[PDB]
Antibody, heavy 222, light 210 residues
Framework: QVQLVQSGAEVKKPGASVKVSCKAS????????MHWVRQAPGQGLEWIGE???????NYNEKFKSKATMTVDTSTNTAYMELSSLRSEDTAVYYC??????????????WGQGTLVTVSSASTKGPSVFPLAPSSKSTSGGTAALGCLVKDYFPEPVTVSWNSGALTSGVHTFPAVLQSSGLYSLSSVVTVPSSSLGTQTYICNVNHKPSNTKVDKKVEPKS | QMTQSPSSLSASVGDRVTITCSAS?????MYWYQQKPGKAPKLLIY???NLASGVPSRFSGSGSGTDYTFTISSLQPEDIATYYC?????????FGQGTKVEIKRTVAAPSVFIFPPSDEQLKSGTASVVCLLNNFYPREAKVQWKVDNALQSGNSQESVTEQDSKDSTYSLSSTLTLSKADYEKHKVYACEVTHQGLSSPVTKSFNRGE
């Protein structure tokens, strides 16, 4: 399968610079343009520009002063660099490619996006606490359990259950911003209450801005 | 200037959804992208009317002069998303403003669950108490936190999921934050849930330390 893998989310100080990377796998990608797109939180899509490896670059006029696109031909990695960062640069940045290949098949591929947060505040990894199943979780032969993911900065956190093996009945809620200036979210899952004695439930919490991954086993309390 | 319309819409499963974009020029084709929440945009229509590879048949696109149309012929639960048109014009790609597509479905009552704070969190200084409202419709819901029959305010926050891609329901999480001292000072902790699908407000509670 063909994949574009981007560098992880990062907090950066105002005035500083950041360099997002986009790594291409499964396709040659030498003779195709690489697009960069931004999406401010809760906003629409804006095209930043395009880069040709085989070595021209076309820029959107608005992003001429702020962005620089480069590539590393040996590693299959496209780079986009944002200079003199301000609060208005806080956005998900995507790499994308759309074209015909050698065989004349039409493709469109996107990276997973990179949330650059511009803030003076330092990164902080989450504290993870269980949301234990109980008699107050039994509704009709099924029980709810979860993980509380507290006091991180910045966004985002991703959560999986049992390393991705548990997907059904999972709800991971949007983060709330707390009075302290730190984010908190919960992730929950409904399971059979007959599984509680035998099945193991672990939430896998990833927070790339602080380079932190936390696994937390969620058990019924004694 | 590119104009996508409407900004949002709600329809039932099996309904025809119609979205429009009006463009500056007709010399380049129109593209249509689907963006599901948390995910990257996914191409559905290229060159005005060509289905992208793998995309279901219920999706189509057309154009006439500077007026372009995107149609979902039969709305499915998994089709909830924000849709964007895109066109190359005056040396750049411009996206439309977007159209949020939502599903109207039957009323469903929330399943309510309450979670005491963990011993680990509590003894380190703070108690977060969590009320969970599971798979309900419509979106509007009232969560009231009670501590020894006293109604709380200023000390809770909540969030709601995007509409579920399978059953078109919403889920809600409410967190009541207290200091260790304030938490250990009281016995009965309850969340009271008001929703259209419940014939009377539903309370879920626990007594501290049992």
């Amino acid at each position: 399968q063909v994949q574009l893998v981007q560098s992880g989310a990062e907090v950066k100080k105002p005035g500083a610079s950041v360099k997002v990377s986009c790594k291409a796998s499964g396709y040659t990608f030498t003779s195709h343009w690489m697009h960069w797109v931004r999406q401010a939180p809760g906003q629409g899509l804006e095209w930043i520009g395009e880069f040709n490896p085989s070595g021209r670059t076309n820029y959107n006029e608005k992003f001429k002063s702020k962005a620089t696109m480069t590539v590393d031909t040996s590693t299959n990695t496209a780079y986009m660099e944002l200079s003199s960062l301000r609060s208005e640069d806080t956005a998900v940045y995507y790499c994308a490619s759309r074209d015909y290949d050698y065989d004349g098949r039409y493709f469109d591929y996107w990276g997973q996006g990179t949330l650059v947060t511009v803030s003076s505040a330092s990164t902080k990894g989450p504290s993870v606490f269980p949301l234990a199943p109980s008699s107050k979780s039994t509704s009709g032969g099924t029980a709810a359990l979860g993980c509380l993911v507290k006091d991180y900065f910045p966004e985002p956190v991703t959560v999986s259950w049992n390393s991705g093996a548990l997907t059904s009945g999972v709800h991971t809620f949007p983060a709330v911003l707390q009075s302290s200036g730190l984010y908190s979210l919960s992730s929950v899952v409904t399971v059979p209450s007959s599984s509680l004695g035998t099945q193991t439930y672990i939430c896998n919490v990833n927070h790339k801005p602080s380079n932190t991954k936390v696994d937390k086993k969620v058990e019924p309390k004694s | 200037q590119m104009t996508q319309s409407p900004s949002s819409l709600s329809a039932s499963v099996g309904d025809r959804v119609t979205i429009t974009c009006s463009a500056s020029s007709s010399v380049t084709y129109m593209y249509w992208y689907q963006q599901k929440p948390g995910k990257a945009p996914k191409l559905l229509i290229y060159d005005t009317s060509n289905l992208a590879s793998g995309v279901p048949s219920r999706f189509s696109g057309s154009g006439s002069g500077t007026d372009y149309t995107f149609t979902i012929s039969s709305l499915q639960p998994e089709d909830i998303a924000t849709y964007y048109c895109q066109q190359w014009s005056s040396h750049i790609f411009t996206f439309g403003q977007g159209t949020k597509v939502e599903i109207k479905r039957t009323v469903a009552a929330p399943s309510v669950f309450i979670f005491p704070p963990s011993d680990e969190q509590l003894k380190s200084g703070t108690a977060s108490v969590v009320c969970l409202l599971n798979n309900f419709y419509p979106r509007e819901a009232k969560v009231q936190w009670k501590v020894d029959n006293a109604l709380q305010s200023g000390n809770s926050q909540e969030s709601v999921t995007e509409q579920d891609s399978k059953d078109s329901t919403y889920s809600l999480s409410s967190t009541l934050t207290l200091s260790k001292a304030d938490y250990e000072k009281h016995k009965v902790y309850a969340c009271e849930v008001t929703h259209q699908g419940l014939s009377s407000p539903v309370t879920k509670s626990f007594n501290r330390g049992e």
